[PDB]
UniProtKB/Swiss-Prot annotation, chain A:
Biological process, per Gene Ontology: mitochondrial translation
Gene Ontology, cellular component aspect: mitochondrial inner membrane; mitochondrial small ribosomal subunit; mitochondrion
Name the record gives this protein: Small ribosomal subunit protein uS8m
Oligomer and partners: Component of the mitochondrial small ribosomal subunit (mt-SSU). Mature yeast 74S mitochondrial ribosomes consist of a small (37S) and a large (54S) subunit. The 37S small subunit contains a 15S ribosomal RNA (15S mt-rRNA) and 34 different proteins. The 54S large subunit contains a 21S rRNA (21S mt-rRNA) and 46 different proteins.
Highest taxon above the source species: Eukaryota
One Pfam family matching this protein: Ribosomal_S8
InterPro entries in the cross-refs: Ribosomal_uS8, Ribosomal_uS8_sf
UniProt family annotation: Belongs to the universal ribosomal protein uS8 family.
Subcellular location: Mitochondrion
GO molecular function, one term: structural constituent of ribosome
Family matches, as SUPFAM superfamilies: Ribosomal protein S8
Protein's job: Component of the mitochondrial ribosome (mitoribosome), a dedicated translation machinery responsible for the synthesis of mitochondrial genome-encoded proteins, including at least some of the essential transmembrane subunits of the mitochondrial respiratory chain. The mitoribosomes are attached to the mitochondrial inner membrane and translation products are cotranslationally integrated into the membrane.
Disulfide bonds: none
Curated annotation (Swiss-Prot), chain B:
Family: Belongs to the mitochondrion-specific ribosomal protein mS26 family.
Residues shown, of full length: 160 to 212 of 318
Other facts: Present with 2010 molecules/cell in log phase SD medium.
Protein name: Small ribosomal subunit protein mS26
Subcellular location: Mitochondrion
Top-level taxon of the source organism: Eukaryota
Purpose: Component of the mitochondrial ribosome (mitoribosome), a dedicated translation machinery responsible for the synthesis of mitochondrial genome-encoded proteins, including at least some of the essential transmembrane subunits of the mitochondrial respiratory chain. The mitoribosomes are attached to the mitochondrial inner membrane and translation products are cotranslationally integrated into the membrane.
Signal peptide: none
Quaternary structure annotation from Swiss-Prot or TrEMBL: Component of the mitochondrial small ribosomal subunit (mt-SSU). Mature yeast 74S mitochondrial ribosomes consist of a small (37S) and a large (54S) subunit. The 37S small subunit contains a 15S ribosomal RNA (15S mt-rRNA) and 34 different proteins. The 54S large subunit contains a 21S rRNA (21S mt-rRNA) and 46 different proteins.
Swiss-Prot record, chain E:
Residues of the full protein shown: 216 to 258 of 286
PTM per Swiss-Prot/TrEMBL: The precursor is processed in two steps involving mitochondrial intermediate peptidase (MIP) and mitochondrial processing peptidase (MPP).
Misc remark: Present with 6960 molecules/cell in log phase SD medium.
Role, per record: Component of the mitochondrial ribosome (mitoribosome), a dedicated translation machinery responsible for the synthesis of mitochondrial genome-encoded proteins, including at least some of the essential transmembrane subunits of the mitochondrial respiratory chain. The mitoribosomes are attached to the mitochondrial inner membrane and translation products are cotranslationally integrated into the membrane.
Species per Swiss-Prot/TrEMBL record: Saccharomyces cerevisiae (strain ATCC 204508 / S288c) (Baker's yeast)
Name under which the protein is recorded: Small ribosomal subunit protein uS15m
Similarity annotation: Belongs to the universal ribosomal protein uS15 family.
From Swiss-Prot, chain F:
Lineage start: Eukaryota, Fungi, Dikarya, Ascomycota, Saccharomycotina
Residues shown, of full length: 2 to 183 of 237
Name recorded for this polypeptide: Small ribosomal subunit protein uS17m
GO molecular function: rRNA binding; structural constituent of ribosome
Similarity comment text for this entry: Belongs to the universal ribosomal protein uS17 family.
Main localisation: mitochondrion
Subcellular location: Mitochondrion
More details: Present with 2810 molecules/cell in log phase SD medium.
GO BP, sorted A to Z: mitochondrial translation; sporulation resulting in formation of a cellular spore
Amino acid sequence: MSLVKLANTCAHLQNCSKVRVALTSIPYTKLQLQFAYNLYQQGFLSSLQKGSTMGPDKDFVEVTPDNISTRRLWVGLKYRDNKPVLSSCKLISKPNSRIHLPMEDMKKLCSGVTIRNIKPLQPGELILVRAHNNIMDINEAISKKLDGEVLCRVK
Amino acid sequence: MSQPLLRNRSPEESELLKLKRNYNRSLLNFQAHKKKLNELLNLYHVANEFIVT
Amino acid sequence: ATLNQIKRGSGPPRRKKISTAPQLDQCPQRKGVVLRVMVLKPKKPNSAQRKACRVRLTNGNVVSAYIPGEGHDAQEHSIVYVRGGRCQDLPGVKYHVIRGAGDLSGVVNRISSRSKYGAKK
Amino acid sequence: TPFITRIMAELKEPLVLSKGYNIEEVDKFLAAIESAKREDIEKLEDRREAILRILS
Amino acid sequence: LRYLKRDNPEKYYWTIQKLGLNDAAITDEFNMDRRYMQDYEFF
Amino acid sequence: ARQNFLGLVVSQGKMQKTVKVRVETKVFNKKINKELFHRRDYLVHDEGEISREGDLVRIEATRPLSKRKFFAIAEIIRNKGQQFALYESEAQLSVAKEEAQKAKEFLDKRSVRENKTLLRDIRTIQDALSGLEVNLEKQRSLI
RNA sequence: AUAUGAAUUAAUGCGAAGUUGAA
RNA sequence: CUAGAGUCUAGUAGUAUGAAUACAAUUAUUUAUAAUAUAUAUAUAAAUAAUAAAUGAAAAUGAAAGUAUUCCACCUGAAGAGUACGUUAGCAAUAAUGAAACUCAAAACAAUAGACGGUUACAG
RNA sequence: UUAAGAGUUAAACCUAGCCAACGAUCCAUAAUCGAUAAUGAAAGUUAGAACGAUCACGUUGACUCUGAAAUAUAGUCAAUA
RNA sequence: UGUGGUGUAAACGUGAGUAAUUUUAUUAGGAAUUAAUGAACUAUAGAAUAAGCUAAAUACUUAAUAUUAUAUAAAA
RNA sequence: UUUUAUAUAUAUAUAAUAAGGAAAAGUAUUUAUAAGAA
Ligand SMILES: [Mg+2]
Ligand SMILES: [Mg+2]
Ligand SMILES: [Mg+2]
Ligand SMILES: [Mg+2]
Ligand SMILES: [Mg+2]
Ligand SMILES: [Mg+2]
Ligand SMILES: [Mg+2]
Ligand SMILES: [Mg+2]
Ligand SMILES: [Mg+2]
Ligand SMILES: [Mg+2]
């Protein structure tokens, strides 16, 4: 659940996009898995695969403590019309200053107001909020009236 | 995402894994024991030539 | 620089405003008495014979004040009123004597910017 | 500290062998080799002594 | 040994007593400043 | 209700029936835009002297009990300081028994070696005439 | 101690046209 | 420079491109291993050089002066000034901490074209 | 003693503590604040005149009576004029 | 202009002191778990006696009549 | 891929074999708003 690991993942995706690599890997943790799934469902990532450090898994493998150390989540990146779909990725809640917003301030952020010096939501943008150990889009978090921590911003 | 990420090992698996790891460690000890005994064997073989008297 | 360093005291430099008329102790003007009237040469490139006076104020400080206008009627021990403003081409005269107050009269035969020079019409 | 005393005493015991060896095991191995030939006493004793002096 | 204190309080005191140390020695800040050597006559 | 705080005991026994409890709260610093913690040390009343340094406790507001002591110990959330005290007291002698028997064993092996020649005996019988390996074999067999 | 004045006294800022060295 | 010893020892004193983590396209050399049968113009790594993208005021950097995270130290125009005073240690020397008023619209950095130099050579 | 806790004040006896480089103690300065005023895009910054809320004082210091509540713009004593 | 009752703890003005040892701001904050205090009105009941001293009294004195601490239980 | 077949010592080397094909028409409020010059 480290914001440090998530920040490292965000920078890794940015770098992978800038050099135009089709397939890369990230740590296989539930925060990373939920993050990758939310990016993928919104069309930012081409595909998710299970794998090891060497590469994606050929056949299905059970996840146990024996192999957990070398497990990796292989994300495939989308490049459309000679441009990267996942152009940029940022962390709103830094490990120093963590931003836990109530639902009203999330509505304000989605409505264009700057709360706690957070630049509000933009049209083509995606903001992720973790509530009670589940990652979800900020719009859905508002839809479920869930208080949560705002994590990141991928544009 | 709802399901647990990893299936924790049952205690039977824990015991079996203990057996494997102890086998590895004891095998290393066994090799080292062979080597020390062989070195002692060669030392005693040639100890005729050494001069203690 | 870092959030803790910012917290511990570091930050943007204070855009501090110091007074350009310190001896007026945050007053628009102050009354004063002219000890002597002195003629001084400004810093070059400018060349002139500029009229200034040494003034003891009512708060007790002593200042140097430029006497504007074509003609000054100020002698020693005259009563004057001093406002802020420095003679730019003369170092050390940080104040302006008011014309039309105390023993300083309005500029004679002044017809434009009369208010600044104490003239009447 | 009693623990340190015992540990540092074990080093200075009258006869303790190095490199992972102990007197009992070397004795067993020497006697075993001596037996092996079956299927002058002075020389074998001083040979043993030289071995032990080597490993002290 | 500080970590041992946090993890296993019993084994920690067992260990510091066996090795000849009070909790004060482990817990406090220590450096071999020469004043330490003068205090305990290290040389 | 009466003010209740959760804290950690820091100083105990320096005083009579009084302890010091470190209390931590959350506050929003607008200047740095951070939800940061703030610390304060409360002089708290301990009656019964059931407090030890390193205990997590709940302190509750009371009448003024001294110039600076307006709180009293309410509940020991965790008694880890008491555990430390007990374990110290136990260890001081628990190690001692093991040390004594260790010394006995060490001197006993000294004596056993002191009794120790058999190369003479072994040779006399020849004139008329690995355990770890077996343990490895056991481990392999069970595996 | 907080101030206010002080013979005696330390340093430095400016400017006038210059004077002297060659760092 | 100070003490003890017969010149030595023991000293006082403390001057004269931050660290870590994740990631980041090539080429060419080497370098160290791991192989397979000198050949696979062998793969895996680190060192060196030129790059790409990226960054930068540029020079230039180019696996870092790049993308990100965390911790610390430091800077806030020039001069006054690392000065004065006070304190801190020191027999002292010195060191550390360290201002203020006044004066000015300056000052500085990289690079561009120039004329300049006993600056270099080279020619006509 | 008080209607009432408390080294608040007075008495007695114990313990050695408490605060402090996230700045004590000391010094200088200041009445404090708002749904008040000024300003800014805002965070904030400034003022505390005016409207309103709280405190302190009624030439200076201490004490006393009354009283539920006062060291009262009261009384006594002293200081200054 | 004699004896008495009520009123001047308010309001008015000021910002000296005050960096908190009692000040200001805030809390759906507390207890010691604040008095047989009503200060001045409301709604209810009752009572309003005797002497003295004042020149006299609704002035003053003296006297008459009208919650807490115990003990027993009950609960929480 | 999978399943079997032969051979060899439950396993190994070889040969063959592959189940994923569906069609249908019609069914605004967008929000707060930060400029520089010599
Ligand atoms: Mg004041
Ligand atoms: Mg103020
Ligand atoms: Mg005031
Ligand atoms: Mg006001
Ligand atoms: Mg007014
Ligand atoms: Mg008063
Ligand atoms: Mg007056
Ligand atoms: Mg008074
Ligand atoms: Mg009043
Ligand atoms: Mg009456």
